Design a protein around this ligand. Structure first.
Ligand SMILES: Nc1ncnc2c1ncn2[C@@H]1O[C@H](COP(=O)(O)O)[C@@H](O)[C@H]1O
Lengths: 350, 348
């Protein structure tokens, strides 16, 4: 009775076999992200989030949400066989986009799709996401996977994350008070973050013919693979620490694709510009290396890459005092003073 | 300036601006309720909870992330995408509706082998239609173009629904008991599960083209039957709950069909008896069965068989539910079974 036809097909969301050490390990990573506000939910990784505590404070609590993917960095992780940071990359890629609003991130969900994927690799992705969540008080409340060989090319993966945060309406940061003479501050990046990896991968491994274990003069022993796979920094805690301690941040911009010129204008009031002193901050070795190998102009590098600044903060000069002191405990990034606001209407790098 | 000369560009017109993108933005804006905060540009919109907070003792934020599966391949094959956007919304949203949550915001990500703004416009039209029907605001999204990741012409989509429920009102099945009744609401077709099986049957086993039809599909092409959108149960479930129907549990019939999904909401040990002839099974399922000579078990293991949502409640709730269901003309209510102490699913 109840025969099967012997045809080849499967649900996209098929789960990983029962008993695989991976699923329990993943649940253990996920549960470390929970605050006291988390309730049981639906499915293997589903939870709910009680709002009672977080909103007690706000007269008009506002929900702030954003969804983002990792992008082509996945291909480098796969080539190197190192996924330890890629889950963390995903979290930062989504979350920094709401941090700029002054929002407090509270929940995260993720989707990972592929043709085939070793459960061991998934456990590593989840470990990394959960590490990023746990460190800044975000609860990972759900996730999904899809295995679709007729959609994904062999060995390829797409990862998407959705962050949700809360801000009091009157405390939304959107740059409206920015004025000429305000200062541009920058927090260092760890390298490319999650932009530019198609170029990086092809430059080193298809054009130059390197292996990921190779090094170069600029890297002083560190491998190309390791330098490329450094995680996109999670700026949640440092920004929270600044805001919690009364730093008057007037605007922020997360430096992703298209460098300072693409990203800073969003936050500038109409008619205002910015001037960035490129020599005021360190350019990570990986950028210096790519520029040299490729015979790429300064102009074009700054057009495309973050060049060492992953987040910008606009505030009056006298806020540097408090920021510098507060930044010391945050050892994953470095605070610089990098520029100033002008009445040019343009972002200029000098 | 003088006669008889070439016009450099005579014989070629190139559409200016970004007309698909602007129409897409217009569809999104129609979803906005008064709680949406705008004027933040490229980011998306924000969402004020002030009205929520007023109306809830301990509000709980309920969220779900979902894709639609390989149904996307059928949409691509047929070149039809509006229903697929609607599919995405329903696939995510129905999974929180089962807890009694009110959906409030939706975000979407769509990745493309090659991003065509006219296809995006269509997808977003469909999502926005679903949002607007049930008071959900489409507050942001993202796209990716990844030809090295995707097979030629294919896409993948992720939707995220966010809703609110009062903690005490969370429906979780804990009060289900032996003798409670299982009710079902009709589906529109396969919804968003079983498409791998469906594509294998129609396009490989039967060797049909999506433009073919069969007498039992009542004129409609295979492609169009397959592409009917996943029903959004938000409004009918809200109608039931707002008007006093004592719902003890719900199961959204997705991957694994009745067999997987009904037991998940039952207190451990309880079972269900389902009268398979108490609800209509759309012709598409009977056709697939016939093409593949598929056993009843294999059918119920993949397909919803005509019921997209199950509701467990006492027998004496049925009268009220039938009265309330009348206005909801996109789905039909049936009484389909009962709760037992069998620890399993029995189909008679
Ligand atoms: N998948 C999507 N759904 C809805 N809106 C989107 C989507 N992708 C981008 N947008 C909107 O398109 C505009 C520009 O997007 P971006 O290219 O990410 O800057 C913003 O208003 C976004 O909210």
């Amino acid at each position: 009775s109840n025969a099967m036809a012997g045809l080849k097909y499967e649900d996209a969301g098929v789960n990983i076999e029962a008993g695989n050490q991976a699923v329990e390990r993943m649940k253990q990573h996920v549960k470390k992200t929970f605050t006291q506000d988390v309730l049981t939910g639906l499915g293997s990784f589903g939870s709910l989030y009680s709002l009672k505590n977080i909103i007690n404070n706000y007269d008009d609590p506002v929900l702030v949400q954003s969804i983002d993917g990792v992008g082509t960095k996945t291909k480098v992780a796969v080539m190197c066989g190192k996924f330890e940071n890629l889950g963390y990359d995903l979290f930062s890629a989504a979350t920094n986009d709401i941090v700029v609003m002054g929002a407090k991130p509270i929940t995260f969900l993720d989707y990972v799709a592929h043709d085939k994927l070793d459960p061991a690799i998934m456990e590593e992705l989840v470990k990394g996401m959960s590490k990023a969540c746990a460190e800044c008080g975000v609860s990972l409340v759900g996730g999904e996977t899809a295995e679709m060989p007729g959609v994904y090319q062999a060995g390829e993966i797409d990862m998407v994350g959705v962050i949700t945060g809360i801000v009091d309406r009157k405390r939304i940061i959107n740059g409206e008070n920015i004025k000429e003479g305000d200062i541009v501050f920058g927090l260092s990046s760890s390298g490319l973050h999650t932009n530019g990896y198609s170029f990086a991968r092809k430059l080193f491994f298809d054009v130059a013919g390197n292996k990921h274990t190779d090094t170069y003069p600029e890297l002083e022993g560190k491998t190309i693979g390791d330098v490329l796979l450094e995680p996109h920094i999670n700026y949640t805690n440092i920004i929270h620490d600044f805001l919690d301690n009364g730093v008057d941040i007037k605007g922020m911009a997360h430096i992703t694709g298209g460098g300072f010129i693409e990203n800073i204008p969003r936050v500038l009031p109409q008619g205002l510009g910015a001037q960035i002193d490129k020599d005021s901050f360190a350019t990570p070795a990986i950028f210096k290396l790519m520029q040299r190998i490729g015979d790429i102009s300064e102009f074009e590098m700054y057009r495309s890459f973050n060049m060492g600044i992953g987040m910008t903060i606009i505030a009056s000069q006298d806020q540097f005092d408090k920021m510098q002191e507060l930044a010391k405990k945050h050892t994953n990034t470095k605070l610089y003073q990098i520029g100033k606001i002008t009445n040019s209407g343009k972002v200029e790098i000098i």
